[PDB]
Prior knowledge:
The structure holds 3 chains of a larger assembly. In chain A, the strands form 4 sheets. The first copy, chain A, has a 4-stranded mixed beta sheet. Chain A has a 4-stranded antiparallel beta sheet with strand order 2-12-7-9, with no helix packed on it. Chain A has 149 residues and is mainly β. The longest helix of chain A has 8 residues, at 10-17. In chain A, 44% of the residues are buried. Chain A has a single domain, classed as Distorted Sandwich (Deoxyuridine 5'-Triphosphate Nucleotidohydrolase, Chain A), CATH 2.70.40.10. The radius of gyration of chain A is 16 Å and the shape is globular. Helices cover 5% and strands 42% of the residues of chain A. The interface between B and C is medium-sized, with 26 and 31 residues. The structure holds 2',5'-dideoxy-5'-[(diphenylmethyl)(methyl)amino]uridine (3 copies). Residues 42, 70, 85, 88-90, 94, 96, 98-99, 101 of chain A line the site of one 2',5'-dideoxy-5'-[(diphenylmethyl)(methyl)amino]uridine. It is classed as hydrolase/hydrolase inhibitor.
Amino acid sequence: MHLKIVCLSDEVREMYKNHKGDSGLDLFIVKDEVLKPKSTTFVKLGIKAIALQYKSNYYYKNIVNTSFLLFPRSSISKTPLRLANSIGLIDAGYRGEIIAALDNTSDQEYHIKKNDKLVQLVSFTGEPLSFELVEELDETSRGEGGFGS
Amino acid sequence: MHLKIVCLSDEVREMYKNHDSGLDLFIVKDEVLKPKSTTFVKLGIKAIALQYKSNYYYKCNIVNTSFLLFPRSSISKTPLRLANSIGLIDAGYRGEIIAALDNTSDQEYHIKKNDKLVQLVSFTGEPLSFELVEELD
Amino acid sequence: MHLKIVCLSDEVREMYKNHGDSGLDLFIVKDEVLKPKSTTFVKLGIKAIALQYKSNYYYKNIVNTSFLLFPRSSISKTPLRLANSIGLIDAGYRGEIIAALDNTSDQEYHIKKNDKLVQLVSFTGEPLSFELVEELDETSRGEGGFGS
Lengths: 149, 137, 148
Ligand SMILES: CN(C[C@H]1O[C@@H](n2ccc(=O)[nH]c2=O)C[C@@H]1O)C(c1ccccc1)c1ccccc1
Ligand SMILES: CN(C[C@H]1O[C@@H](n2ccc(=O)[nH]c2=O)C[C@@H]1O)C(c1ccccc1)c1ccccc1
Ligand SMILES: CN(C[C@H]1O[C@@H](n2ccc(=O)[nH]c2=O)C[C@@H]1O)C(c1ccccc1)c1ccccc1
């Protein structure tokens, strides 16, 4: 599966230019942030993305945009943070910012830091993922494309 | 993927008659979830999923396939969490679909008929269609 | 999908000798106390590689494939929850399979040998078969090769 990723700021672009055949692509926490105790926080990941796969014939009564998945990384387990919706389902048509809904199960504030990696993108196929950085997902303004400001 | 869905009552039938990689399922009756609890919430439907037959590696045309029960992203706005993370409905399962919901709150939580907290999903992530049937077979 | 499983002890081997579904249940292999309000990396005493028919995939005969670790539905009646929601095991991973279990209770939780709390699942949702092997490959991490 191939991901076209739009970085929503230059700071985020630099992180993905220096990204430090896996079935999961790690996403960065892009800003230092304090998560309140016993709370759910909708953490903005500073990116938009579309996923591309080979077209396949499916029962329903060359390359296509596909739905994809937002998994916790296994290393999330050592923290008190849990993905509220278990596994995120990103539909083929979504053009908004990718967000991780994080439950802080601790009674203390939790500090996430720029460069932390708590979540990853995954294909329904489970195949290796490649990605590229693009300026827009499509022609629409929500896709960051098209004429004008 | 195409689903054949048996609604276990006419009240449920009506909801789905008047109903994307995920097919939203309805909460079918008003219910109180106790604080700090897990409740097996009955969704009032039975279902089988149909896909094209595939060659798969295994050591000893349309087929029924296993499918998945996901939380809806909007569940995050509630204190409810799916206890088993993602439900796996085996190809051979004929019973009612249940959502095992944890109430993470220290107070009771009220779910309402017509609430949409969970969704069915194919292993392929392909769009879903459904029809209502009287029997699964 | 077909799994080649290395059992890390004879005790575990005996469990899997005496074990069609989309999920292959894995055993808890040792009695263990999970502390209240904790996350415990529970060692499952196995290593495993998954095999599927090769498929063409967009990226810019049988092969090693990635697979998934799901909670079993019966975990729901316990206070135990899978910390990382669903586990992702990358193609060819050679480490011991671990279940990171949150004990959400304020009491210690006793897991028992023979308990079944998690299962392996294919990305295709196809039936799983398995065989017991002594190594995954020639590497020490695969439990194979010379020595020592
Ligand atoms: C509105 N999103 C859902 C969208 O996000 C996309 N989406 C879906 C799943 C996911 O894990 N991440 C994500 O960005 C597609 C969905 O259409 C709300 C939201 C809810 C749960 C997780 C993440 C976001 C939301 C709620 C409150 C504040 C901000 C965002
Ligand atoms: C018996 N189901 C498991 C089946 O339900 C099907 N199943 C599986 C996963 C799921 O999320 N939902 C579901 O309906 C296929 C599984 O084979 C018990 C059950 C336990 C936990 C969650 C959901 C159901 C159960 C036990 C006692 C009372 C009611 C339900
Ligand atoms: C190193 N694993 C991650 C790998 O485990 C494999 N892995 C992945 C997901 C999973 O649920 N179980 C598992 O064994 C493939 C992943 O690449 C660490 C780990 C962290 C949390 C849960 C499970 C494992 C780990 C860290 C420290 C001590 C023991 C285990």
